[PDB]
Symmetry: D2
Subunit: 249 residues, 4 copies
């Protein structure tokens, strides 16, 4: 007989895009579970509001100004976290935006900005984090925020669907490379969540759910906690879809 593990006491997490939405709930949930959390965002003011909540709720957190498209910013922010809290055990690569246009109308600079935030952000934060996690094979957890759009397409979302598909590939390579250093990788794939990023609802957005339900920030934060606290590397390399039956993986 066994039981669930959820204690993150003594762990340090970095969450990108943690000033808002999914990333904010993951960060607040990890802090409740005992982790010290780096709140990494391009919106430093909004990042410090998240830190203020975590600290008032009895946790530990640090606001980190980080544009995840910038190599120097990512490197500097990861170093600040390690200098403040002593290491980095968990990375959640979550920062993202949406830009909607059909391929034939889409500006090239909009395509490139989308790949830079979703794909370059994942590479840069992963590489910076694993230089620490690989030391003495201490290890750690890397979670990417994918989507149902990691697995299938929608109209007018070419760069988003391309990037969310690509994150599966990056996760799968890290699972293979990280194993000898006790690093595990995962992709969480939500359906539509009513964050700021989000008949329109029921006939377009939730049409391919089985039950006409949004995914919630708590759904994703519980899954992120289950993975981060899991006692073995059994889920390394996996994606898990959390979508109320929209794409059954």
């Amino acid at each position: 007989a066994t039981q669930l593990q959820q204690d993150l006491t003594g762990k340090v997490a970095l969450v990108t895009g943690a000033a808002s939405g999914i990333g904010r709930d993951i960060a607040e949930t990890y802090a409740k579970a005992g982790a010290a959390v780096g709140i990494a965002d391009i919106n430093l003011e909004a990042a410090q509001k998240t830190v203020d909540a975590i600290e008032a709720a009895g946790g530990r957190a640090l606001a980190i100004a980080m544009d995840v498209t910038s190599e120097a910013a990512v490197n500097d922010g990861v170093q600040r976290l390690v200098d403040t809290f002593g290491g980095i055990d968990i990375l959640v690569s979550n920062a993202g935006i949406q830009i909607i246009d059909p391929i034939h109308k889409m500006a090239f600079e909009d395509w490139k900005k989308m790949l830079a935030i979703h794909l370059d952000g994942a590479f840069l934060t992963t590489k910076a984090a694993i230089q620490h996690m690989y030391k003495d094979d201490k290890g750690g957890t890397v979670i990417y925020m994918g989507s149902v759009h990691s697995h299938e397409a929608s109209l007018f979302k070419a760069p988003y669907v391309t990037a969310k598909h690509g994150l599966l590939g990056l996760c799968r390579v890290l699972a293979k490379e990280g194993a000898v250093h006790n690093v595990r990788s995962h992709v969480i794939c939500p359906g539509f969540v009513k964050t700021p990023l989000v008949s329109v609802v029921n006939d377009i957005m939730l049409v391919n759910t089985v039950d006409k339900e949004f995914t919630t920030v708590d759904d994703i934060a519980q899954l992120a906690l289950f993975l981060a606290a899991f006692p073995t590397n059994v889920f390394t390399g996996q994606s898990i879809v959390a979508s109320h039956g929209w794409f059954m993986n």
Copy 2:
């Protein structure tokens, strides 16, 4: 902010193949979380040993003699659970065997026995459980024990790989049909786990069984029971229709 849901207080679960291995740990884990558990197995003596362990830890369980290939045995055993504990909230369709032979040598009898246990057992237990769960749209959770062999093949396991692929299909249909009645479905897909199904099999570990893991680790019964508890206690239907692979990187889903 949130936290994990772990409580199954007031719930009633049926676990097939709960006399041994993965099913025994799921059943003991559910009982520790507060569920009353039906220990359904063809081995009634070993089923009662699971019940004794659950009772020794302060939980509630019932040994149920059930050959999951038999419609009467499934229907009667689900009815015995409902009569005893008042309903059925969770079904774990887990009973299974392995029979190894290449296709060109495999006895048709062995092909049919494999599909009867894995696929007919899943259909019969699902149908019997959802006739209760659909009443007043009370709902419930159906978990199938799949495999990495739900998603890819190995040599000499045709009927097993066929069946474990088939369970994804049945799960995906139930997710669509069950939604209006608050029924959710999932498939758990372990890699190799050192139960008796596998221990018997070894007389191989590093260069056959674990060759496509990233870290040369077996999956454990506690890995699968923790995932089974996470799903059964989950507070929303967000994972309905999904399979989750628990294999140390053997088939990255």
Copy 3:
């Protein structure tokens, strides 16, 4: 530079369910490409109508009474083909039916009949064919008729979706086992095709059957027969173990 291979001169094919629909067009297409074709069906009169069409076009075929759920009927019918034309190079396991009911209402008899036709038929025909193909490592091609329902579910089709998922598993095992004997395996996965299986079903097209296509088009029997000819005539084993979805964008594999 290269070009398509289309020639099946000298080859012998067995197509199950070749009295109607997708199987009839595959069989007629193979015969036009030079294959001698066994027209295996439970409907012997309609099987002979396929043979008459093949002969009228200058091809060779044989009507074979075969209930693919019967081990004796499969073994005897494969042996009749080998006795007549000298061997078996290509098997297309295609016979099938549809039975629609939600899980909670579905008769167990109907569940078992569906798995017997789709899954036992695939096992029995595969095993009988590869005992010939494995001789002297001559080899051959085994194609299973899957579906979009190999990869995702629809309401009210539990046993069909289970079976079509299962055929991927059997194909994947055969690709591994058959390699040393020059046997390759594939699954073709059509979307809706307006055969009698579907025509009967309509008395729906735009908002159920074709709702998840990108272009509101049925798949056609000629789409599937062209893919079946491309695979059977292919000059290397490069596609062994693969499924190919032919559905106008319903499930993008």
Copy 4:
């Protein structure tokens, strides 16, 4: 009863990376089938050698200097093809390179160059081609050269595996957007092919094939011809793996 279709008489194809390897065989195969072919490559000399072969073999072709990372080069090259041969019916987005390093050692500029060639090249060539194909809903075929590495990972290939995964996503969005304009999309996913880009063979490279066989350039060119000449849009949005049993899709 039916038969295979392979005639490309009256069609115009653009193949990127067509001076070498897979792209060269596709181009020569399309020209044999009657298409006029744009041989688009960064190596213009090698592109003109391919054109010389096609022309001596009785076909029609044009050498196009095209770095597929450059918006202007892609736009100019597609326009030259349309000015020379009257339109564009088929695009094969195939140009690629490989750069091998584990994530923790990989230079950021190597990550970005890989995504630019594989992903920006696919976007830029797609967008330029479909501005023509969408006119009067004439339509056309877009094929991306993926990989088994569209579907699973290998060690030390992070940006390649990320990009080849991403191409599935781009293809799936184009299938949905293109349908109303009679545009179909596909991804071909080869296993290892002995091009210049390619115990090492049998125990590493071909270890996950069922039969220890390389995929060949003719395997891929036959599949590319089957798709380009197919009489209906039935395969739109699909990937097809051609790998001797390495990843069974």
